[PDB]
Enzyme design. Structure first.
Site, mmCIF file in Angstrom:
data_model
loop_
_atom_site.group_PDB
_atom_site.id
_atom_site.type_symbol
_atom_site.label_atom_id
_atom_site.label_comp_id
_atom_site.label_asym_id
_atom_site.label_seq_id
_atom_site.Cartn_x
_atom_site.Cartn_y
_atom_site.Cartn_z
ATOM 1 N N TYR A 55 0.818 -1.214 0.000
ATOM 2 C CA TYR A 55 0.000 0.000 0.000
ATOM 3 C C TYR A 55 0.852 1.265 0.000
ATOM 4 C CZ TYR A 55 -4.181 -2.765 0.984
ATOM 5 O OH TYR A 55 -5.202 -3.647 0.938
ATOM 6 N N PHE A 218 -20.936 6.940 -4.989
ATOM 7 C CA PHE A 218 -21.362 8.328 -5.068
ATOM 8 C C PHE A 218 -21.269 8.910 -6.471
ATOM 9 C CE2 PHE A 218 -19.114 7.304 -1.111
ATOM 10 C CZ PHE A 218 -20.183 7.314 -0.240
HETATM 11 N N1 LIG Z 1 -7.678 -7.260 0.106
HETATM 12 C C1 LIG Z 1 -7.772 -6.408 -1.068
HETATM 13 O O1 LIG Z 1 -7.467 -6.833 -2.133
HETATM 14 C C2 LIG Z 1 -8.253 -4.955 -0.931
HETATM 15 C C3 LIG Z 1 -8.507 -4.198 -2.028
HETATM 16 C C4 LIG Z 1 -8.921 -2.906 -1.854
HETATM 17 C C5 LIG Z 1 -9.090 -2.372 -0.575
HETATM 18 N N2 LIG Z 1 -8.841 -3.135 0.520
HETATM 19 C C6 LIG Z 1 -8.997 -2.632 1.886
HETATM 20 O O2 LIG Z 1 -10.512 -2.128 2.130
HETATM 21 C C7 LIG Z 1 -10.422 -0.936 2.686
HETATM 22 C C8 LIG Z 1 -11.569 -0.040 2.177
HETATM 23 O O3 LIG Z 1 -11.478 -0.003 0.765
HETATM 24 P P1 LIG Z 1 -11.812 1.461 0.109
HETATM 25 O O4 LIG Z 1 -10.757 2.474 0.526
HETATM 26 O O5 LIG Z 1 -11.993 1.393 -1.388
HETATM 27 O O6 LIG Z 1 -13.244 1.768 0.890
HETATM 28 P P2 LIG Z 1 -14.596 2.488 0.296
HETATM 29 O O7 LIG Z 1 -15.436 2.892 1.490
HETATM 30 O O8 LIG Z 1 -15.408 1.612 -0.620
HETATM 31 O O9 LIG Z 1 -14.035 3.771 -0.573
HETATM 32 C C9 LIG Z 1 -13.456 4.817 0.168
HETATM 33 C C10 LIG Z 1 -13.367 6.029 -0.797
HETATM 34 O O10 LIG Z 1 -14.543 6.602 -0.898
HETATM 35 C C11 LIG Z 1 -14.411 8.069 -0.234
HETATM 36 N N3 LIG Z 1 -15.641 8.379 0.502
HETATM 37 C C12 LIG Z 1 -16.141 7.950 1.668
HETATM 38 N N4 LIG Z 1 -17.308 8.582 1.877
HETATM 39 C C13 LIG Z 1 -17.534 9.398 0.839
HETATM 40 C C14 LIG Z 1 -18.579 10.264 0.552
HETATM 41 N N5 LIG Z 1 -19.770 10.518 1.358
HETATM 42 N N6 LIG Z 1 -18.578 10.980 -0.571
HETATM 43 C C15 LIG Z 1 -17.534 10.863 -1.438
HETATM 44 N N7 LIG Z 1 -16.507 10.023 -1.153
HETATM 45 C C16 LIG Z 1 -16.510 9.281 -0.018
HETATM 46 C C17 LIG Z 1 -13.330 8.043 0.525
HETATM 47 O O11 LIG Z 1 -12.621 9.366 0.497
HETATM 48 P P3 LIG Z 1 -12.490 10.299 1.887
HETATM 49 O O12 LIG Z 1 -11.291 9.874 2.699
HETATM 50 O O13 LIG Z 1 -12.367 11.748 1.456
HETATM 51 O O14 LIG Z 1 -13.720 10.119 2.737
HETATM 52 C C18 LIG Z 1 -12.401 7.055 -0.194
HETATM 53 O O15 LIG Z 1 -11.770 7.699 -1.200
HETATM 54 C C19 LIG Z 1 -9.072 -0.373 2.206
HETATM 55 O O16 LIG Z 1 -8.553 0.512 3.097
HETATM 56 C C20 LIG Z 1 -8.187 -1.629 2.198
HETATM 57 O O17 LIG Z 1 -7.706 -1.750 3.606
HETATM 58 C C21 LIG Z 1 -8.432 -4.424 0.349
#
Ligand SMILES: NC(=O)c1ccc[n+]([C@@H]2O[C@H](COP(=O)([O-])OP(=O)(O)OC[C@H]3O[C@@H](n4cnc5c(N)ncnc54)[C@H](OP(=O)(O)O)[C@@H]3O)[C@@H](O)[C@H]2O)c1
Length: 298
Positions: A55, A218
């Site tokens: 990451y 969103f």
């Molecule tokens: N095992 C794997 O292969 C894998 C793959 C991908 C991810 N992951 C893990 O899953 C965790 C979550 O994944 P993700 O980061 O994609 O989570 P997500 O909740 O689906 O997406 C988060 C994104 O959406 C934004 N967001 C949240 N609320 C929002 C809103 N009301 N309006 C607009 N944007 C909003 C966030 O930005 P802001 O910070 O500005 O709120 C962030 O950019 C990751 O941290 C990682 O640890 C694992």
């Protein structure tokens, strides 16, 4: 506070919501701001944190480690998950994105994770992606070396099919503690393809990634209908936002997934876990599902 959940029979106990640090470098926090962010989500009951070696171009682990160096007392309040098995082009030696699941790389990756994180152990180490070159005997050797030395408490996988899960579990004297997979209204194939069936059967809980589609919930036009319905269900449930309803929709699944929060704004973190209080009906659940997919259940 946030519900505690046993990840597997005699497995680790995690917080039902996980803080994911995939996007840590994007938040551009100083080490002190990160300490405050960690302290605040721990205070909410978000104790389990999710990492990977890759990451942030191999930087998130180390940045998190700067916080743990500042406030070492925080380690005992959290469960650290990290992962290995992926090799990206962020490293000069990697001319292609690929996988490395040999024994020495797994041991050395976890050991480097420990140095980056300024901690003496991981709670959970995952194989990050299934690898067509994965020799389950070699991964098993690596896990036992790490477990026997006290460096890693539990082991799991991410993005595995059931056949890949069963292959690896067959070599291990302890139960795999999760299969961390993508679960969202915008991405549902694992509900029916057997992945979540196997996990429920074995009583292994999935950590759930990109519950908000990485932001696609969103911003993508084809999910306008889903946003409309989530708003209507939010009004019916007295929820504060459509994402709270999405989190409740994921939490409702009978494999009991652990949603991973990806936001760097502690107010979104605070708001996300309110989803635990919502009482979503089946019909609301199937209304949200249809709004995402466009068609009814068979
Ligand atoms: N095992 C794997 O292969 C894998 C793959 C991908 C991810 N992951 C893990 O899953 C965790 C979550 O994944 P993700 O980061 O994609 O989570 P997500 O909740 O689906 O997406 C988060 C994104 O959406 C934004 N967001 C949240 N609320 C929002 C809103 N009301 N309006 C607009 N944007 C909003 C966030 O930005 P802001 O910070 O500005 O709120 C962030 O950019 C990751 O941290 C990682 O640890 C694992």
């Amino acid at each position: 506070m946030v519900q505690r959940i046993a990840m597997a029979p005699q497995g680790p106990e995690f917080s039902r919501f996980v803080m994911g640090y995939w996007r840590l470098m994007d938040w551009k926090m100083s080490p002190g701001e990160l300490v405050s962010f960690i302290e605040q989500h721990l205070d909410l009951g978000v104790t389990t944190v999710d990492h990977a070696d890759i990451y942030g171009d191999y930087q998130c682990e180390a940045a998190f480690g700067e916080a743990l160096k500042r406030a070492p007392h925080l380690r005992s309040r959290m469960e650290i998950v990290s992962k290995c098995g992926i090799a990206t082009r962020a490293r000069a030696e990697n001319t292609i994105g690929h996988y490395i699941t040999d024994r020495d790389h797994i041991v050395l990756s976890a050991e480097q994770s420990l140095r980056n994180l300024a901690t003496d152990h991981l709670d959970l180490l995952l194989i990050h992606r299934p690898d067509p070159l994965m020799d389950a005997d070699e991964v098993a050797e690596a896990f036992l070396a790490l477990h026997h030395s006290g460096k890693v408490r539990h082991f799991g996988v991410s993005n595995f099919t059931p056949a890949q899960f069963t292959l690896l579990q067959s070599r291990l004297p302890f139960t795999l503690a999760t299969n961390q997979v993508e679960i969202s209204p915008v991405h549902q194939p694992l509900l029916l393809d057997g992945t979540l069936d196997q996990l429920q059967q074995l009583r292994i809980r999935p950590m759930a990634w990109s519950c908000l589609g990485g932001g696609r919930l969103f911003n993508e036009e084809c999910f306008q209908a889903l946003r409309d319905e989530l708003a209507q269900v939010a009004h019916e449930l007295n929820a504060d936002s459509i994402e709270q309803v999405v989190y409740a929709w994921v939490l409702r699944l009978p494999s009991q997934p652990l949603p991973i929060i990806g936001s760097g704004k502690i107010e979104r973190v605070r708001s996300a876990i309110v989803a635990e209080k919502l009482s979503m009906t089946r019909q609301q659940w199937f209304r949200i599902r249809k709004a995402a997919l466009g068609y009814d259940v068979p």
